[PDB]
């Protein structure tokens, strides 16, 4: 592992960040002082959920809660393939992270994000309560249930 960390090959270190993510070694990746890994995540954060989650962990441990709430909220409003329940977790985290002070950011900007995440989380829970009840309902034909699961187990719908 010395030979690994003693390298200056950049495509290599990118390939190793991806490999650590694959194997699940949050142990060793979260323990890198470097910003090089943060910058690498900032480009692909809004591309994949698993990468965004890593980026948000780096922000939170650095008391940058508002920036994580921003990543999580945009990810919940996006058209990436994300389940409704995963979008409930993202909003719930963003709601908490925007409710606490982050230095350098105005109280107004925090509250406006904590409010957008609170409303979207309220709608998401309604949608989850619906989807669950509809799937379990004995009086609903199977043919329709599959159709319900397609349109409700994804991005959050209007009221």
């Amino acid at each position: 592992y010395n030979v690994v960390n003693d390298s200056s090959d950049e495509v290599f270190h990118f390939d190793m960040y991806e490999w650590y993510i694959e194997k699940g070694w949050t142990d060793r990746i979260l323990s890198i002082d470097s910003p090089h890994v943060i910058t690498y995540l900032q480009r692909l954060a809004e591309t994949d959920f698993r990468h965004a989650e890593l980026l948000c962990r780096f922000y939170t441990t650095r008391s940058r809660f508002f920036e994580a709430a921003q990543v999580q909220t945009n990810l919940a409003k996006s058209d990436l393939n994300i389940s409704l329940k995963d979008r409930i977790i993202l909003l719930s985290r963003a709601k908490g992270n925007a409710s606490v002070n982050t230095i350098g950011i105005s109280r107004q900007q925090q509250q406006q994000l904590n409010h957008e995440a609170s409303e979207l989380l309220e709608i998401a829970h309604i949608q989850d309560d619906l989807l669950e009840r509809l799937v379990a309902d004995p009086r609903i034909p199977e043919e329709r249930k599959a159709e319900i699961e397609e349109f409700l187990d994804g991005p959050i719908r209007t009221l």
């Binding site: 034909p141 043919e143 329709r144």
Partner: peptide, 17 residues
């Protein structure tokens, strides 16, 4: 923003196509 429209929906109790 909510807008009720009972007019044209999709029969929740009938399959598609």
């Amino acid at each position: 923003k909510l807008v009720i429209n009972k007019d044209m929906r999709t029969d929740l109790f009938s399959p598609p196509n």
